[PDB]
């Protein structure tokens, strides 16, 4: 049973991954129901890999990333293969559609330490921390990416590039009070008209807050009223005072105890 399963899986994966994936996914889906569910003897370290690869090839990225991350923690599989699985998980998470599960996956990948030595760690850090991803980093990621994963719409605006542009706009929302169309276009490396159209669409759909003054060609983000800003800055100053006092009392304990004792008397 196990030998037949291994032979069929190997031959099918080779000749069927040879660029007719529809029959491969159909056969896997049909046979998976009655596979075994309990086989043991290292047979569990190939079914999960094949399942994750199929899920990646069927344009569903977040669940494939979850499977790769789960596989990355297995003690039996070698260090190099675990690192490859983690790299695939990072790529799939980056390429996945935006969502709550994607945000938690990004948080988990950032919390992971082994990602630090990966080639996409910079992009992971920028995506998680809401920074601006530059064109050169995007080009490097595209070069590193496999040809299959580059899903592009026929009219243009490849999915990854559109997601990066929207992320750049949303991250610039956190950095500017108001920005003109020319400077936004220079920041996003797109024409000013396209920048205006994308910003207006994002504002209409509710993803980001702001309003566009077309006569001046300026997009306005949040206002940060003066009195609430005053409240926030007063809170920050008092927090600084508290932290400084804690640092003082954690360095010269006897001196600060003596000073506190004399504080009541004086």
């Amino acid at each position: 049973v196990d030998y037949k399963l291994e032979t069929y899986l190997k031959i099918a994966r080779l000749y069927l991954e040879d660029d007719d994936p529809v029959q491969a996914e159909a056969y896997i889906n049909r046979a998976s129901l009655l596979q075994n569910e309990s086989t043991n003897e290292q047979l569990q370290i190939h079914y999960k890999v094949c399942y994750a690869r199929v899920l990646d090839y069927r344009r569903k990225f977040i669940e494939a990333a979850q499977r790769y991350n789960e596989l990355s923690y297995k003690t039996i599989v070698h260090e190099s293969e675990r690192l490859e699985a983690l790299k695939h998980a990072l790529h799939c998470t980056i390429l996945a559609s935006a969502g709550q599960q994607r945000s938690r996956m990004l948080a988990t990948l950032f919390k992971d330490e082994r990602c630090q030595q990966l080639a996409a760690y910079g992009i992971l850090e920028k995506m998680y921390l809401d920074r601006i991803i530059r064109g050169n980093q995007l080009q490097e990621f595209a070069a590193m990416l496999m040809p299959h994963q580059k899903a592009t719409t026929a009219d243009g605006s490849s999915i990854l590039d559109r997601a990066v542009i929207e992320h750049n706009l949303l991250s610039a929302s956190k950095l500017y009070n108001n920005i003109t169309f020319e400077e936004l276009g220079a920041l996003l490396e797109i024409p000013a008209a396209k920048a205006e159209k994308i910003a207006s669409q994002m504002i209409t759909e509710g993803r980001m807050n702001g309003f566009i003054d077309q006569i001046d060609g300026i997009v306005h983000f949040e206002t940060r009223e003066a009195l609430p800003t005053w409240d926030k800055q007063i809170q920050s100053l008092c927090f600084q005072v508290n932290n400084l006092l804690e640092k003082i009392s954690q360095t010269a304990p006897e001196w600060t105890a003596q000073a506190m004792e004399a504080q009541m008397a004086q």
Partner: protein
């Protein structure tokens, strides 16, 4: 010890319940004690209700002449001041929550009900009086608690009132202090009609030793929010509503002056004084903050 009050005596509670002394008297319950956690939960729930009304339930016990409250739990009702109790959703929720809390260690039983009157004082309306009358007629004891989450923010002190009604047909003999409470025009008739059918217990708060230690440790970091409050911005719709109500009351007072309960001008003056004093307090807080922080030019 201070934690002694936290000890629940099943035998003593059963003996007190089976030897009910509140039947012979009518003003038997005169003191109402509330734990710190119960008060905080009540206040936060009433505040998070917003402008609408919310209502929950209260779990406690009785010690002789006083009524002690240990916990409070909200019940959904979808809030929104529905007609009354529930489409049976809350009816199931009360029993479900009490049963679930029984198997954890919350072994106390219900003692009353609380609800919010956001912006129009702390009193029992006609429906509230009927509800409390019905509850006391069958399940005893029971106390009503009314909170004002908006006036709490506006005045800087909690607006909490614990009440208990009188049996049907009983006429209480005078003894009416009747301290002044500002009440809008659209809710004054109910307060006037239903005012002698209930009395207000004297409410006090208590806390445990660990609670006291934790609060005195927490103040060392919580002193910032007092100095960064800015109460003049969080309460503006309330002040606008107060000014509208005051203008209507002034119009009624002028109509009474032109015509031929008593001296509505005095009541309007008291309302205006309260609103203006609150506004000036809010302004002088900001003046103090500016003097402290904006003038210490390096």
């Amino acid at each position: 010890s201070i934690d002694e009050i936290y000890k629940y005596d099943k035998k003593q509670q059963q003996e007190i319940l089976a030897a009910k002394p509140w039947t012979k008297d009518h003003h038997y319950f005169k003191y109402c004690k509330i734990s710190a956690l119960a008060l905080l939960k009540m206040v936060m729930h009433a505040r998070s209700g917003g402008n609408l009304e919310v209502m929950g339930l209260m779990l406690g016990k009785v010690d002789g002449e006083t009524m002690i409250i240990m916990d409070s739990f909200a019940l959904p009702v979808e809030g929104t001041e529905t007609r009354v109790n529930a489409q049976a959703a809350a009816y199931e929720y009360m029993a479900a929550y009490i049963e679930n809390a029984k198997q954890v260690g919350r072994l106390e039983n219900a003692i009353g009900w609380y609800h919010s009157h956001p912006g129009y004082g702390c009193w029992l309306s006609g429906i509230d009086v009927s509800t409390q009358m019905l509850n006391q007629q069958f399940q005893e004891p029971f106390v009503a608690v009314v909170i004002d989450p908006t006036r709490t923010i506006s005045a800087g002190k909690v607006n909490l009132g614990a009440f208990r009604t009188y049996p049907k047909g009983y006429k209480p003999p005078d003894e009416g202090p009747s301290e002044y409470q500002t009440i809008p025009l659209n809710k004054i008739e109910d307060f006037g009609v239903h005012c002698k059918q209930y009395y207000a217990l004297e409410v006090s708060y208590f806390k445990s030793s660990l609670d006291r230690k934790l609060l005195e440790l927490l103040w060392n970091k919580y002193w910032v929010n007092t100095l960064s409050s800015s109460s003049l911005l969080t309460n503006a719709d309330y002040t606008t509503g107060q000014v509208f109500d005051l203008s209507e009351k002034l119009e009624q007072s002028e109509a009474q002056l032109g015509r031929g309960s008593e001296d509505k001008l005095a009541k309007a003056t008291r309302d205006s004084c309260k609103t203006t004093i609150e506004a000036i307090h809010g302004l002088m807080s900001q003046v103090i903050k500016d003097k402290l922080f904006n003038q210490i030019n390096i």
